[PDB]
Amino acid sequence: PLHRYPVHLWQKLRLRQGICARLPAHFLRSLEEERTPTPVHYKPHGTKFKINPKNGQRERVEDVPIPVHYPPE
């Protein structure tokens, strides 16, 4: 068999049922939304395009955040 929903949607489903549903709408917005924090440990790309020096062609670039471990302390 298969699960009806993908695993990554499981958290959203729980927030939509039970005592979680009765929480205020504004509070759930904070839980639902996922926003990336400001870069700290890596330099962000200033532009969305740069020239690849070897072939001299315009190439799309993306920012991949470094995984950071936050201790409970």
Q: Which residues bind other proteins (CB under 8 A)?
A: 1-9, 12-13, 49, 55, 57-58
Helix H or strand E segment including 15: helix 10-15
Q: Which is nearer to other proteins, 9 or 21 (CB)?
A: 9
What residues pair up with 50 in beta bridges, in sequence order? 59
Q: Is there a contact between 42 and 65 (Cβ–Cβ < 8 Å)?
A: yes
Residue closer to other proteins, measured from CB, 62 or 73:
62
CA–CA gap between residue 14 and residue 16 (Å, rounded)? 5
Query: Nearest approach, Cβ of 30 to other proteins (angstroms)?
Result: 19
- In angstroms, give the least distance from the CB of 72 to other proteins: 28
